[PDB]
Design a protein around this ligand. Sequence first.
Ligand SMILES: [Cl-]
Ligand code: NA
Ligand code: NA
Length: 323
Amino acid sequence: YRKLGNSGTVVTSYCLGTMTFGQETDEATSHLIMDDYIKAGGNFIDTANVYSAGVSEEIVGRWLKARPQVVVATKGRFPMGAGPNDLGLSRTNLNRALNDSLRRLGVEQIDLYQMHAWDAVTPIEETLRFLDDAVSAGKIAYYGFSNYLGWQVTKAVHVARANHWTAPVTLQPQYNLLVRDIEHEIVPACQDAAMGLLPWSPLGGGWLAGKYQRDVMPSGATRGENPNRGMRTWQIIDMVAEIAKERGVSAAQVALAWVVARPAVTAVILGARTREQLADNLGAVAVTLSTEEMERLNRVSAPAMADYPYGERGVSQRHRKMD
Ligand SMILES: [Cl-]
Ligand code: NA
Ligand code: NA
């Protein structure tokens, strides 16, 4: 399935993460995971400059040289060195940060440029003005955010609208059956601005895929190096598993098919480290959960909150009954 990312550019329902392409996966296995992804019919690569110190981008860049169209996304904001202006949404750092993602990807235009995180030190106006100048220059097509809060998305959107700049297209949050707190302020804020979600960590870092042996709950390997903030967790993993094998499919596969069908979601980022793991994740394309499986999964992962701003009672009093 093809969707837009709040713009005219369409993109396939699954996105290829490339975090692994320097740390764990080597460049040859990276090229073949990408070759598989394409051959499965994807057109969406997500990378970052800080992924393996930009090696991640260079492998993607070399693979684009070998292959002769794909929608490419990358990010800024995080430390590329240990200096004080080697991080930040300042236009000084972002200016070289975009030039270096450009030379490392060997493209002349990045399709999606993303702020990897909010930056309280840079005024948002400076950042958005830098991104609009980049759009005018043909260095980037669109921009979006990752790890912005709700009110922060809302302030950016309207500040862009106030200065006749382009609108943000996407938000890249962490979102899976275990990590659903973006539904209180961040999702409402994107839906209000017609924006699309790009969820990453859809297997919750492994907790949802099984592959363990009824593990210990504070095991730091699968997640965070703490193993339970939201990674009850065991009930969710269990429900996912039951639905998994009655449908004759992997537990990973119905968790993936759960994220792809949630409101506002344009494309899920896949963290395949292997060719086989890519095949195991892309099996979820065939799975389409029924309205019931999903409303099941929804309520068992429903993030309960202290009553006032984001739990039952505050929600209920913000609601307006039509009657
Ligand atoms: Cl997009
Ligand atoms: Na769409
Ligand atoms: Na779907």
